[PDB]
From Swiss-Prot, chains A, B, C, D, E, F:
Annotated effect of mutating residue 9 to N: Loss of 5'-FDA synthase activity
Gene3D superfamilies on file: Bacterial fluorinating enzyme like (2.40.30.90), S-adenosyl-l-methionine hydroxide adenosyltransferase, N-terminal (3.40.50.10790)
Residues that, per the record, bind S-adenosyl-L-methionine: 9, 14-16, 70, 151, 203, 208, 262-263, 270-272
One Pfam family per UniProt: SAM_HAT_C
Notes on activation and inhibition: Competitively inhibited by S-adenosyl-L-homocysteine (AdoHcy) and S-adenosyl-L-homocysteine (SAH). Sinefungin is only weakly inhibitory.
Function statement: Involved in the biosynthesis of fluorometabolites. Catalyzes the formation of a C-F bond by combining S-adenosyl-L-methionine (SAM) and fluoride to generate 5'-fluoro-5'-deoxyadenosine (5'-FDA) and L-methionine. It can also use 2'-deoxyadenosine in place of adenosine as substrate.
Name this polypeptide is given: Fluorinase
Assigned protein family: Belongs to the SAM hydrolase / SAM-dependent halogenase family.
GO terms, molecular function: adenosyl-fluoride synthase activity
């Protein structure tokens, strides 16, 4: 019962995703295609990365992740197919997902296929990888690929061959590590006893504010739940709350909560109200946290 | 072939829904997950209720409805799982759905799982229930549930266990009726021989206007198809038309139709034009009908 | 493994599409329902037609295409169900889709079911058809159809019966060709050797600009992939570039590309940037191209 | 433009071949079907082998060879489909076919599909193969195959699916070499400094006599063009002549030529007269050559 | 991609068939001409019938069958063109042809054109017809037809006009049923519990013996696979075998097999040896079958 | 849509013709290859000539006629390629072929390519020619031709290049008329006013008898369609009948018809019965006709 989990920049307003799906069922008749999202900002490989890096622990072993924003579509660039190493625990704690004690996932159990444009930068950093190949064989891509639709030609199509059991190492030649394109991720800076980062995302549809300050950064300023914090956004908004597990800990509806989001990152919100929307807070604003 | 029908407030802009689906396929490998919608206004339990109350008659017997907006995520609250009694006829006329005379559905054939925050208020009113349980067993929820994602931890995951055949009565202790939270439904008032309600929803993407005035409220006033109505909105924007089965009965395109929608409620529209959008008509506006 | 590909104007904000899906699973339990889109402008049959005309070559043989915008819902009109002839090659070049040399599809392999309102106009022009029938049998539609929901009653429900093996010729009487409603496609006209048409679509989410000028319009205008073009939009905005296969051929991020999109038509974009959104370009604006 | 080249034992006296072709055009609408021959002695796998071993170098790359005599039709046996390795030079000299220096053919460019009964023995010996699969998938053969017509059910039909782009590896499980049936090729023996073979074929319609003594058997005896040979047949009818390139080198019409045929093998004829017919010479007769 | 499937009595030894083909390509440049056979006994309309009655299910809808033996060539007789009703299932079981569950063929989807000499007797009996016309219009036949070649003038030529889309009903006037010439087919006689018929054909090139006793005649003496039968040929040869699906069921090579042939008729053969040839068995000999 | 019409002495019993076809498709991928016949008596150039002389008026303009019996294969001889002048009317009367008044063909529209051995003798006599060239260029034949297969090397291969647009004048040097080998046609001679010729062919499969006496030989012998004739064959067998247009004019099945065949020549047959086969009549027997 193979699964392809599909994340693209193709949108939800025309038949582009359906074209790709049609081809997935043609190649792998017993497949289940799970939509991740198709709503990302086109060409923002850093946003795309965010929607896919946390996926593996939630899916059955053998799942293929077909992930693509493809601004170099039509050129002589070719996709990269990689078998990751660690499925990786996640969340505010760092645990397996599922009921009971969670579903432990074996190593070497998921494949990602993507343009070689840095989309997989965070996947490779947080999971590692065992093997990586250029996608070139005409067994798994078109001999005459549509120039403006490499997300279909070079990702959707070969993803389905992989789901159907095409050997990974036969899609094309092995890639050396330096041949895999990466974007740089800005580090969280130690700064006195303060940690200095950015708003990484506005968490839609709620308007929560997510930062790039990870639980591990907090876990060696020595900051746990209960700590009284000052989280300054945009240089000029010094929010103050204790770090709490969840929104309702702030008390009355509308009160500020500082918490660790489900991806493991320091976040700020209001309790059952929107923080970001009324005040137009945005990705890219500064975020400093301290006692 | 189990089905879970999934309605949430998680949105369509990141991987949130997909994480849920991954676990659903993990737990119940044979399952089909049907998206109801994920676009509801967060925390608006009355809106969520409208998207789920009409579902049972459409679905195969044995379908599990996983329905969630979870503003109390991370607190000691626990989800409720209920087996409904009557699948219930619906529509403007009150009938079974499907081809021929429709598909009559047996009693006791659908389970809802939701936060215990009133989301199921109208489901329980219109369908009844046979049994209800608190969802607490670590066989069906996580031992260490993610504080900010109870929509996954306490709804998606246990829904998949129920679809996989986990006995409903084993999810946790039985609930007494007074322990299941309800919201108050605004009452249609009689004011002279006029009926006074509210705009319950704008029917996107068309811009039709739905009220909370039911066909039963109309048949108790002796108002049937053919009747000349004055229907007044927001307390100034008035309208006049006979009650007709459908939009085309208003004649020329753009003309006003007053009709019964597919959920059984008095509604107003323009024939193949939008009523609500040009005039910025809105849910919450007063709606008064006089004959 | 029956598939129904489903394109509607029902939106993504309530349970409308899920009601249809529920019944599709009720009638055809082993079906896969693939969403095309549900976001088209309500009642815009020409837009709807664009989202379905290119589908067949991407899908497995036997796929049913359930395609609906139904402004005449609740009237005496009845749907049309047709088995197309040619699956038809497509793309900027004209090819079968898939890996290798692509996947050929046998003739007569796909059925469309649609309101008889012209929605299938371009499907029948591009693919031809082998048989057509009015959809009237109570074996495949309700005896008492819901007046405002013919997209469910007269499209979704009968599509599921067809997917399940119900004989196409038993749905109702055969329709003559003149009884199948058609829309008039706006023709690409002449002044000098400059082609004058329209913007047929903004290609979301990228903001690329699609015209109704086909590859064939360009050949024997003597415009080939080398040609330096002046393209005026809305009778005001002029652009200049050679015709190229893809976006990156423009050079730097932001540069103008005039190209043939993946559906076979002359289009214009910026390279990994949005052309339409910053200039507020729209469907239905005039488009003029000259060497 | 896919080609299937079709060799069978179905004859030319009824509609058998045509039924096969009808299905081939049905499945692969763009296909060209080329008849090799349908006149072979039924069930004679060694004869069929001779009509197909020399074909690849003549055909465009990507050609599918559908080759069948099927005495085990209706049993549990299943056809084999193999992609050959080397297209292989041929003729009296050993060269590529075609104008100029010939058309060199890339490796891995031809598929044979046949009963697994030894028919492909010489194809595999002379060309090698890259992969071989059992043909079992109901995507490419009938669910209820006609018991007496496996030449259509298990060869013609799947050949058309391969020409239409169905992935070879999806026809069924891979075969190990020992699972592909072979016949034993009769060995050319050395008897003194004479070579002892057999008449392998009468070359109709001319009545030339072909032996199984190869040019490589001759060059290993230091026998080249110009050599005076005694070639003895059926163990009594002897002949004497030099080895020459062609028939006209025997001088007057009716004179004996000893030559290398276009398949690379020692042969004997009369110059523009028949050798075999007047004397009723036959395949299976002994053939001994002394220099 | 129109197809003409061509069956004649013109032979394979001169340019007669090529003349007709040349004219087919002249009239319908995109046509594919599929040879059925050209080897029938001249003027034996009953043999001709046998080569064409089984064709439709194997070919794409819209195929034109050009079928002719024309002993009345040069007279004032004119051909008949008919659109058949049922494509009809066939074979030992009675099923659609092709991979999977077969290709279902729509009604009214094939045209036959023939001399009105009884050639179409079995086509009309087993398929039925919707409309029939005399072929007279000089749009589709020569004004001055070659007297000795009506197979070209009155069949080949108009067949190509029909393939190219000439309206069937415009070739000439409608024919009443009684105006269509039929030969009589001898019935299978019930006779005790024995069924009494004839050898209808020797199945070349194998020498299998085909009778006119159909699966339906067996299917109400109550005779299925496994029944121990006595099949007496020529009054004096009481063969005995169980009815089996195929030849190899008889066991050792040479053993007698009684089976249902691919056309649906009771047949007798030897397993991978010829029955008819060594003993000179012939069409027209008696055939009786019983328990 | 290039066509090659292919007449050889290669037979229908091995892969010889398919080797030629493979290369024709290799060189001219969009070609249609039409078989004329491959069954002529090997090396009988006069028989070969009969099968090709009447072809041009039946085929689309631009058709290449590849026509070969090559007993001088492997010698220094080279083929001749000629563009004929007149397409030429034919038949018992002398007309253009096709529906209506027939299809006129422009002058200079067809090329024949043949061994320079007299095979084209009657083609050049009946049609004339505009240009002729020796076929020597390595652009169109092999540099190292297979000695025993010049029908492939020097006819099939160059025919495909000509079909593809290769300029006829670039195949080799122009040939003067005297360098084109001719055979001597046996002349219809005189004793009294009785015409004395030969049986030119047995018209298989019917067993009709063709003489070398043309319609023109008969006119100004004063023999018209009323004339009562005595025709003696082989100097022994006498027959009597009037000259009629067709076989059925003889009356009862079996009666004698003397007529003009579809190629323009005096012939004799039985009405829907074989004249030649029962009496063992053959090509080359004497034929004598008198009023
Ligand atoms: C935040 S979401 C999980 C999806 C989120 N995008 C993530 O990745 O973690 C889970 C539940 O949290 C509740 N929630 C989200 N933001 C909230 C807030 N600010 N206050 C109260 N509850 C909130 C929502 O009702 C939703 O059902
Ligand atoms: C009303 S929608 C059904 C979904 C709707 N949200 C409901 O729950 O009843 C079904 C068909 O109604 C047609 N429709 C909706 N609003 C209309 C209007 N104002 N005029 C004409 N047709 C309308 C649409 O084209 C749609 O395909
Ligand atoms: C154009 S989309 C195909 C869907 C599109 N609606 C169509 O029908 O062709 C495929 C890839 O093209 C890339 N793309 C789209 N527009 C682009 C542009 N203007 N510049 C560079 N890349 C673009 C996107 O990143 C996407 O993954
Ligand atoms: C009998 S044929 C099908 C054509 C036949 N004329 C018909 O219409 O059914 C299919 C395969 O059957 C095999 N076959 C035919 N006669 C056979 C026999 N007597 N024993 C074993 N196999 C036989 C042949 O090898 C041929 O490839
Ligand atoms: C030998 S055939 C090629 C086909 C043959 N079956 C083969 O596979 O090599 C090619 C030309 O050879 C010529 N040929 C064949 N046998 C000949 C013979 N014994 N003497 C002279 N010419 C011959 C024929 O006229 C024919 O056109
Ligand atoms: C004579 S054939 C044309 C081919 C022939 N080889 C020629 O070149 O004219 C056309 C039709 O004539 C009919 N025919 C041929 N010989 C006949 C005969 N002796 N009596 C009656 N009909 C005949 C056949 O049934 C055939 O369909």
């Amino acid at each position: 019962r193979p699964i392809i989990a599909f994340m693209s920049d193709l949108g939800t307003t025309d038949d582009s995703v359906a074209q790709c799906k049609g081809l997935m069922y043609s190649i792998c008749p017993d497949v289940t295609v799970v939509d991740v999202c198709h709503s990302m900002t086109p060409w923002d490989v850093e946003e795309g990365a965010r929607y896919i890096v946390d996926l593996p622990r939630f899916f059955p072993e053998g799942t293929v992740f077909a992930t693509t924003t493809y601004p170099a579509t039509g050129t002589t660039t070719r996709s990269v197919a990689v078998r990751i190493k660690q499925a990786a625990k996640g969340g505010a704690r760092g645990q397996w997902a599922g009921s009971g004690a969670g579903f432990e996932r074996a190593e070497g159990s998921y494949i990602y296929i993507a343009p070689n444009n840095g989309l997989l930068t965070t996947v490779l950093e947080e999971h590692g990888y065992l093997e990586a190949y250029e996608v070139t064989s005409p067994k798994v891509i078109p001999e005459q690929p549509e120039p403006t639709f490499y997300s279909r030609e070079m990702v959707a199509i070969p993803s389905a061959h992989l789901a159907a059991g095409f050997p990974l190492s036969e899609v094309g030649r092995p890639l050396e590590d330096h041949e895999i394109v990466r974007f740089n991720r800005p580090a969280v800076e130690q700064d006195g006893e303060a940690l200095v980062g950015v708003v990484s995302a506005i968490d839609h549809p709620f308007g929560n504010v997510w930062t790039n300050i990870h639980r591990t950064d907090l876990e060696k300023a020595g900051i746990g739940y209960g700590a009284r914090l000052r989280l300054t956004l945009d240089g000029v908004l010094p929010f103050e709350a204790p770090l709490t597990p969840t929104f309702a800990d702030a008390g009355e509806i509308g009160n500020i909560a500082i918490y660790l989001n489900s991806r493991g990152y320091l976040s700020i919100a209001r309790n059952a109200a929107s923080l970001a929307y009324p005040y137009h807070l945005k990705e890219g604003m500064s975020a400093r946290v301290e006692a």
